[PDB]
Amino acid sequence: WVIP
Amino acid sequence: WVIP
Amino acid sequence: SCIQFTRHASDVLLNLNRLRSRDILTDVVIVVSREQFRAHKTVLMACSGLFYSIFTDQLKCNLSVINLDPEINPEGFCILLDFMYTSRLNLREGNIMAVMATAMYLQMEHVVDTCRKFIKAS
Amino acid sequence: SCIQFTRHASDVLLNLNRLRSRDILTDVVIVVSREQFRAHKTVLMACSGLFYSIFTDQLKCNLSVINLDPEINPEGFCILLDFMYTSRLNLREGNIMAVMATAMYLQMEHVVDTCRKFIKAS
Ligand SMILES: O=C1Cc2cc(Nc3cc(Cl)ncc3Cl)ccc2N1
Ligand SMILES: O=C1Cc2cc(Nc3cc(Cl)ncc3Cl)ccc2N1
Ligand SMILES: [Cl-]
Ligand SMILES: [Cl-]
Incomplete structure (x- = not known):
């Protein structure tokens, strides 16, 4: 999971 | 396009 | 010896979402x-493992x-x-x-x- | 303020290909x-722009x-x-x-x-  |  | 287009999967999903927003070829209502x-x-x-099981059932x-x-x-479902x-x-x-x-x-x-993970952090 | 799962689109496409290989929920034959x-x-x-046009047609x-x-x-189609x-x-x-x-x-x-690009190189 990432900060888009 | 890439070499997978 | 295939070549690969990096953005293909994301572009496919983006177009499927555009079909959803325009109600095109939608084939089920989730109540x-x-x-x-x-x-x-x-x-x-x-x-979803649940929808996978439901729609592989010969009746459902x-x-x-x-x-x-x-x-x-x-709301949890919508998210x-x-x-x-x-x-x-x-x-x-x-x-x-709820999510x-x-x-x-x-x-x-x-x-x-x-x-x-997010619950554990708080 | 959403978070993103990097592999989600690829995983969705992989599962759609698994459905295709097992002939699950396929709804068209291309001759x-x-x-x-x-x-x-x-x-x-x-x-495909062609299939997009075909399946948005109210009759097709x-x-x-x-x-x-x-x-x-x-073979070109299969590829x-x-x-x-x-x-x-x-x-x-x-x-x-042919491709x-x-x-x-x-x-x-x-x-x-x-x-x-590949033709130009040769
Ligand atoms: O967390 C999850 C996500 C998920 C997706 C699917 N859907 C498939 C799985 C396979 Cl192997 N082939 C085809 C499909 Cl559509 C099943 C279980 C789960 N669990
Ligand atoms: O080279 C290409 C690939 C492609 C895909 C699609 N399919 C869509 C486009 C839009 Cl905006 N919304 C929904 C869909 Cl399914 C149309 C034209 C082209 N041209
Ligand atoms: Cl997931
Ligand atoms: Cl393309």
């Missing part, structure tokens, strides 16, 4: 309490309406349906409990994992 | 000369069989159908001309672009 959500069975199956595969368990929160079609999860303090419970029911293991 | 290819209309639309959207132009090569469901293109010296012609007909602009 969550008083709320109704139109979707593509194949996308639901690709994202032909249903145009699926009613979820009355404990399922419509998860958006994630299915975009890869983006609107996880917030006020919705995390985790809905992801556990829908069998969306990666969403359950991030919810457990 | 290319004597050859038949089963697929999901939504995936075909998401990948309901057809279970689509016949391609007799000039279309079944492109595989690319649609995997992001991987089996581009070879012996098939590049480019088929991609131009199917309106798959990124495939046309790499074929033009």
